[PDB]
Every structure is written in structure tokens, then in C-alpha cells.
Amino acid sequence: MRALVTGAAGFIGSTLVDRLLADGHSVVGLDNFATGRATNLEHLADNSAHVFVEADIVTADLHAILEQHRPEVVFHLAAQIDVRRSVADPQFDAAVNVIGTVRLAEAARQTGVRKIVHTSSGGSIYGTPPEYPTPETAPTDPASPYAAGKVAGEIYLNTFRHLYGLDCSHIAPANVYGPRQDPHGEAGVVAIFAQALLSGKPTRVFGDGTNTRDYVFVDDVVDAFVRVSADVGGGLRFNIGTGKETSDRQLHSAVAAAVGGPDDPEFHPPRLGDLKRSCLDIGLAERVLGWRPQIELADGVRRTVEYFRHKH
Amino acid sequence: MRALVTGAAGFIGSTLVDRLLADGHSVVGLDNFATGRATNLEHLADNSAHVFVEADIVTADLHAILEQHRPEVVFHLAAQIDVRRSVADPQFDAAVNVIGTVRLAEAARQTGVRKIVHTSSGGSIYGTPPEYPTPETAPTDPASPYAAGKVAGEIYLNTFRHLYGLDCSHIAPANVYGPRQDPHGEAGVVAIFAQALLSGKPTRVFGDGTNTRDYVFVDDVVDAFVRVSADVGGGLRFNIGTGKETSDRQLHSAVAAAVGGPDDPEFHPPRLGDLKRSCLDIGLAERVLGWRPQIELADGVRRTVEYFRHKH
Numbered sequence: 136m137r138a139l140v141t142g143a144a145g146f147i148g149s150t151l152v153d154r155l156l157a158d159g160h161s162v163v164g165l166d167n168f169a170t171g172r173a174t175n176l177e178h179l180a181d182n183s184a185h186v187f188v189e190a191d192i193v194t195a196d197l198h199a200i201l202e203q204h205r206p207e208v209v210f211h212l213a214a215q216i217d218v219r220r221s222v223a224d225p226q227f228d229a230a231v232n233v234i235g236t237v238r239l240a241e242a243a244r245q246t247g248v249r250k251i252v253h254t255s256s257g258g259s260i261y262g263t264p265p266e267y268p269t270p271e272t273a274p275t276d277p278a279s280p281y282a283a284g285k286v287a288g289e290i291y292l293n294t295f296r297h298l299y300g301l302d303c304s305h306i307a308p309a310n311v312y313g314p315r316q317d318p319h320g321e322a323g324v325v326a327i328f329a330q331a332l333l334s335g336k337p338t339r340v341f342g343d344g345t346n347t348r349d350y351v352f353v354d355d356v357v358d359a360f361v362r363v364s365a366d367v368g369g370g371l372r373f374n375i376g377t378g379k380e381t382s383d384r385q386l387h388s389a390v391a392a393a394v395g396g397p398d399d400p401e402f403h404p405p406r407l408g409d410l411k412r413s414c415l416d417i418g419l420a421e422r423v424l425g426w427r428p429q430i431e432l433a434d435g436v437r438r439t440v441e442y443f444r445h446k447h
Numbered sequence: 448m449r450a451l452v453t454g455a456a457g458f459i460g461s462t463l464v465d466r467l468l469a470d471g472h473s474v475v476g477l478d479n480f481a482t483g484r485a486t487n488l489e490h491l492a493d494n495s496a497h498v499f500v501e502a503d504i505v506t507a508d509l510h511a512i513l514e515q516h517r518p519e520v521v522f523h524l525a526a527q528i529d530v531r532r533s534v535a536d537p538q539f540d541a542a543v544n545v546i547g548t549v550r551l552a553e554a555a556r557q558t559g560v561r562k563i564v565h566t567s568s569g570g571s572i573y574g575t576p577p578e579y580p581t582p583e584t585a586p587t588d589p590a591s592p593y594a595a596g597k598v599a600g601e602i603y604l605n606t607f608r609h610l611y612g613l614d615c616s617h618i619a620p621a622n623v624y625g626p627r628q629d630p631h632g633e634a635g636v637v638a639i640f641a642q643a644l645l646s647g648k649p650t651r652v653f654g655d656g657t658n659t660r661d662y663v664f665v666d667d668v669v670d671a672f673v674r675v676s677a678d679v680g681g682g683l684r685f686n687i688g689t690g691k692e693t694s695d696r697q698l699h700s701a702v703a704a705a706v707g708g709p710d711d712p713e714f715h716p717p718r719l720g721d722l723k724r725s726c727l728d729i730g731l732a733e734r735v736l737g738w739r740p741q742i743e744l745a746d747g748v749r750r751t752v753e754y755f756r757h758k759h
């Protein structure tokens with residue numbers, strides 16, 4: 136099939152691009168390099184089944200782009216991804232994450248696109264949820280502008296589905312980690328710990344370091360995108376995670392074990408917008424998509440540390 | 448108290464301004480005259496308790512404005528209001544209704560505003576709902592971009608409530624009508640019918656004319672706004688309607704009776720984006736706010752026709 140990936144120059148996006156090409160699809164990648172990296176795509180230079188478009192989803196002529204390339208499925212990964220940034224500038228986060236999504240949907244509905252696969256935020260959209268692990272039936276309750284914009288994106292796509300019959304599904308990942316995640320990003324703790332511990336630079340947790348997340352490996356997340364791209368799970372959100380909680384402190388220890396050396400992070404003040412706990416019920420993805428994560432944290436961390444070590 | 452009304456030059460906005468002034472408040476009205484009219488406020492020219500600011504919520508320095516005027520309550524009525532327009536240009540609708548709301552919330556949380564009263568759309572946010580009359584407990588299921596943006600607005604304000612403790616409640620009206628509603632557009636059917644029939648100009652219904660809405664008089668909606676402006680019903684949405692369905696055909700008959708004119712509408716094609724039925728369960732507003740609509744359709748329609756007959 137023909138696929139278009141927004142945020143294609145990014146961590147998850149470039150990984151998804153590689154997977155789709157392997158699966159025999161032709162791919163158009165779209166990115167403005169806000170946080171993505173050309174090196175994530177540089178190996179594709181001579182592949183005729185791949186075309187890259189440098190474009191900003193907020194302002195670009197998405198209608199013209201989609202009219203040219205006629206993607207059957209659009210995988211929408213382009214976003215402002217930093218929670219703290221969204222607090223600093225909710226307007227900008229909303230422009231990229233809400234307006235960008237709306238413009239893409241409006242383009243897609245006019246150009247024969249079959250389905251948009253949205254990227255929500257399983258890790259943040261439920262806010263402080265009524266239970267853990269958190270199922271998709273739990274109400275959204277965002278507590279950061281980033282989380283709100285992701286919810287708004289889902290709703291707008293659901294709307295276009297009613298309005299025009301433009302199919303959509305929402306991939307809602309937990310905390311994604313692995314190769315190609317920006318070591319110099321403001322977010323992505325696994326990458327941050329790995330890079331710093333390899334370099335012997337200081338590491339820090341926030342609060343008492345008890346804050347928990349659900350750490351899911353990139354290759355597993357990519358598989359979920361592929362599964363949901365077919366005519367299945369239409370109209371629905373799927374939590375994509377492991378259903379296992381790992382504290383800031385516990386993760387540090389695991390990364391230290393993989394790198395070697397000391398396991399002694401600093402403790403810094405909590406950050407406004409960040410939730411205390413995150414753990415996803417992944418039953419729906421199993422039942423409906425046949426999706427299950429293959430990579431356990433210890434293995435994923437080893438893989439990620441090794442990757443960083445080699446590239447370092 | 449100090450109050451600021453966005454959309455103050457509009458139909459509901461100007462009516463609310465009048466009420467707030469009568470209740471002894473100082474009022475700042477804010478509008479860009481996208482759909483509002485200076486004539487709706489011209490009677491206030493010599494009232495020292497009223498100040499008007501011309502500003503576009505999408506781009507104006509709202510922080511500066513709130514820092515100057517220091518409202519305790521912001522009544523947020525500024526919006527793109529036309530469902531079909533939202534279908535024709537979802538980006539523009541999203542810019543005004545989502546981005547505008549986000550910017551206002553970001554301004555308000557910085558200037559010591561106690562509460563924002565949002566205006567949602569009870570009539571559209573539920574889409575095709577599970578039951579009629581529809582309670583607030585029914586899931587939102589928007590089927591127009593306008594409805595989606597109203598839902599997104601709610602969610603962002605709920606987010607700012609978590610983030611900063613900026614209080615919010617969502618007034619979610621059904622179909623509001625009465626004096627000052629503009630008769631010259633495609634929205635505001637009661638006004639359209641009333642002025643056209645008085646003028647002997649053609650009228651029309653859409654589809655088979657059986658579509659229903661819940662018609663609630665402007666003064667009733669204004670009272671709900673005032674009631675919810677106190678520290679009451681924090682974090683909640685309130686359906687503001689009558690809980691009675693009137694079809695397009697029945698409405699036309701009602702307006703024709705009030706005017707004393709012919710009841711012979713043309714029949715035009717359906718409008719994409721328009722729901723078939725809309726009816727609100729108003730129990731929650733009664734319980735929490737002590738609010739009930741006083742004005743029955745027959746009486747409200749009479750008062751609406753009179754507005755056009757007495758108009759300067």
C-alpha cells in the first residue's frame with residue numbers, strides 16, 4: 136500500500152518508516168525537523184519506494200501534498216512531544232497537536248485517504264486515573280496542555296469519521312524508549328540516563344523519585360501501528376504499553392546495571408504537568424489486534440544502552 | 448465584582464452584559480465584531496460601569512488585557528458559531544474555538560481570575576446520543592468540527608483547573624433564541640423565520656423538516672450564566688435547555704402564528720454537519736444551580752417577533 140508518515144524524521148516515526156518499507160509499502164515521510172533528525176532517515180537516500188517532504192503540518196499545503204502522493208493510510212506521529220514545553224507554551228503545543236491534526240484530517244478527507252492512525256498519549260491522557268492498570272474505558276482527564284491536545288486530536292478525528300467516513304484509530308503509547316530516541320532531548324528518561332551514565336555525567340530524578348511509568352520498547356509500538364492500519368479497531372483507541380510500573384529510581388538502577396559503574400542519581404524538585412503514576416491495561420490491543428509487547432524492560436534497556444554506547 | 452465577557456457584542460454576550468450591569472457588576476466587554484455588532488452595546492456608551500475592548504481572542508495580547516482589567520470571572524462567549532461554516536473551514540473554527548480558549552485560559556491563570564465560565568454547545572456535543580433528553584453523563588460524540596472544538600474547549604479548561612486551580616464551569620446551551628439574534632445569516636432559525644415572515648420574504652426548512660432542536664430563551668440562558676459564576680458547580684458542565692423537541696416544521700408554524708403570517712416554507716436539501724435531533728436533560732442545572740427555564744417557546748417567539756417590529 137501507499138503510506139504517509141508525519142513526524143517521519145522522529146524516533147518512533149523513522150522506525151515505523153523502516154518497518155513499512157520492509158513490509159513492502161511505499162512511504163512518504165513528512166517532517167519539519169522541530170525535534171526529528173535527518174540521520175534517522177539518511178540510509179533511505181537511494182530507496183525509490185521512499186520520498187521525504189520537509190513540511191510543517193501547521194502551515195504546509197497538506198491538501199496538495201496528499202493529492203500528489205495519494206496515501207491510503209496516514210500515520211500521524213508529528214507533534215510537540217514535551218509535557219513541560221506544553222506548560223510553558225500551551226498555545227504552540229495546541230497549534231501543532233490540535234490545529235495540525237485538524238488540517239491533516241481536512242486534507243485527508245478530500246484526497247481519498249482510507250484511514251488516519253493517530254498517535255495519542257496513553258501515558259498522560261487519563262491524568263490521575265481511577266485505577267491501574269488503566270483501561271481505555273477509563274475517562275480521559277488530562278492534567279497538562281500536551282495531554283489535552285492529544286485528547287482533542289482523537290475527538291477531531293472521531294468527528295471526521297462521523298462527518299465523512301474517514302476511518303481512524305488511536306494508538307495511545309505508554310512511555311516509549313529504544314534506539315534513535317534523542318539522547319539530547321528534553322524528554323525520554325531512558326535515553327537521558329543511558330547517555331549520561333555512559334558519559335559519566337550527573338543524573339537526576341524528580342521528587343522522591345517514586346514517580347512511575349510504563350516503559351514499552353519502540354519495536355513493539357511500531358508493530359501496533361502496523362496492526363491497526365488495517366480495517367480493524369476502527370473508531371477506537373488502543374493503549375500500547377506493558378502493564379508494568381517502573382519508578383524513576385528503579386529505572387536508574389536498571390540502566391546503571393546495563394551501562395556499569397555507579398547508581399547514585401541526584402534528587403531535583405517536581406515538574407508541573409508531570410503525573411505521579413502511569414500504567415496501561417493492554418487487554419484490548421491483545422483481544423482486538425492480537426498485539427502483545429515482546430520486549431521486557433531489562434532486555435530493552437540492554438538493547439538501548441548498547442545502541443547508545445556504539446553511537447557514542 | 449469585576450467581570451469580563453468575550454463575545455460581548457454578540458446576541459447572548461450583550462444580553463449577559465446588560466444583566467451583569469443590572470446586578471451591580473463592572474463589566475469589560477471584548478469582541479472583534481466577526482459576527483457581533485456595536486449596535487448591541489451602543490446603549491451603554493455613557494455607563495461608567497462598562498468598558499469595551501476591541502480584540503481578537505486568537506491573536507490579541509489577552510494577558511495584557513486581563514492584567515489591566517483584572518476580572519474575577521471571565522464569561523467566554525467569543526466563538527465561531529456556525530456549524531456549516533465549521534464544516535467549510537474546520538481550521539478557522541478550531542483556531543477561534545480551541546486556540547482562542549487556550550490563550551484566554553493561559554492569560555486568566557496568570558492574572559488571578561477566580562473562574563472562567565465557558566460556553567459549550569449542549570445541542571451538538573453529544574452528536575447522535577444514546578438517549579433523549581440527553582444528560583451530561585452521556586459521552587460527548589461530536590459530528591461537526593464546531594461541536595468538536597466546543598468539547599476541546601471544555602477539556603482544556605478542565606486541564607487548566609488541574610494545573611493551576613483555575614476554576615471553570617461549562618454552560619452548554621441548546622438552541623438559544625430571542626431579541627438581538629441576527630436574522631440575516633444561516634444560523635439562528637427563530638430570528639431568520641421571524642424577520643423573513645415580517646418582511647414577506649421566502650423561508651425554508653431543510654430535508655423533510657422533521658429535524659428537532661431544543662429552543663431555550665436568551666434570558667433563561669443568561670440566568671444560568673449568572674448562577675454558575677459563583678463558587679458553585681466547579682468543574683461541571685450544565686445542559687441549558689428546555690428538554691422539549693420542536694421540529695423545523697413545527698417551529699416555522701409557531702413563528703408564523705406569532706407574526707400572523709403564512710406558514711408555507713420552501714423545502715431545501717439537508718445541511719452536512721446538522722444533527723437530526725437535539726434535546727437536553729436539564730436536571731443537573733436544576734439540582735446544582737437551582738436553575739429552570741421560565742420562558743415557553745410560544746411566549747419567547749412572541750417576544751422575538753416584537754423585537755423585530757420595534758427595531759430602530
Ligand SMILES: NC(=O)c1ccc[n+]([C@@H]2O[C@H](COP(=O)([O-])OP(=O)(O)OC[C@H]3O[C@@H](n4cnc5c(N)ncnc54)[C@H](O)[C@@H]3O)[C@@H](O)[C@H]2O)c1
Pocket residue numbers: 141142143144145146147148165166167168169170171172190191192193211212213214215216231235254255256257258307308309310311312
Ligand atoms: N516517546 C514516547 O514516549 C511517546 C509516547 C506516547 C506518545 N508519543 C507520541 O509519538 C509521536 C512520536 O514521538 P517521538 O517519541 O518519536 O518523538 P520525536 O520528537 O522524535 O517525534 C516527533 C516528530 O514530529 C516532528 N514534528 C513536530 N512538530 C511538527 C510539525 N509542526 N510539522 C511536522 N513535523 C513535526 C518532529 O520534528 C519529530 O520528527 C508523537 O506524536 C508523540 O506525541 C510518544
Ligand SMILES: NC(=O)c1ccc[n+]([C@@H]2O[C@H](COP(=O)([O-])OP(=O)(O)OC[C@H]3O[C@@H](n4cnc5c(N)ncnc54)[C@H](O)[C@@H]3O)[C@@H](O)[C@H]2O)c1
Pocket residue numbers: 453454455456457458459460477478479480481482483484502503504505523524525526527528543547566567568569570619620621622623624
Ligand atoms: N445561539 C445558540 O443557539 C448557542 C447555543 C449554544 C452555544 N452557543 C455559544 O454561545 C456563544 C455566543 O453565541 P451567540 O448566539 O451570541 O452568537 P454571536 O455570533 O452573536 O456571538 C459570538 C460573538 O463572539 C464574537 N467573536 C467571534 N470570534 C471572535 C474572536 N476571534 N475574537 C473575539 N470575539 C469573537 C463575535 O463577534 C460575536 O459577537 C458562542 O460561544 C456560541 O458558540 C450559542
Ligand SMILES: O=c1ccn([C@@H]2O[C@H](COP(=O)(O)OP(=O)(O)O[C@H]3O[C@H](CO)[C@@H](O)[C@H](O)[C@H]3O)[C@@H](O)[C@H]2O)c(=O)[nH]1
Pocket residue numbers: 216217218255256257258259308309310311321322323324325327339340341346347348383409
Ligand atoms: O532526567 C530525568 C528525566 C525524566 N525522569 C523521569 O522519567 C519519567 C518520564 O519522563 P519523560 O521521559 O520526560 O516522559 P513523559 O513526560 O512521561 O512523556 C513521555 O511519554 C509520554 C507517554 O504517553 C508521551 O506522550 C510523551 O510525548 C513523552 O515525552 C518521569 O517520571 C520523570 O520524572 C527522571 O527521573 N529524570
Ligand SMILES: O=c1ccn([C@@H]2O[C@H](COP(=O)(O)OP(=O)(O)O[C@H]3O[C@H](CO)[C@@H](O)[C@H](O)[C@H]3O)[C@@H](O)[C@H]2O)c(=O)[nH]1
Pocket residue numbers: 528529530567568569570571619620621622623633634635636637639651652653658659660695721
Ligand atoms: O432557514 C433555516 C435555518 C435553520 N433551520 C433549521 O433550524 C434548526 C436550527 O438550525 P440553526 O439555527 O442553524 O442552529 P444549529 O445549527 O442547530 O446550532 C445552533 O444551536 C447550537 C446549540 O448548542 C449552538 O451551539 C450553535 O452555535 C447555534 O448556531 C435546524 O434543524 C435547521 O434545519 C430551518 O429550518 N431553516
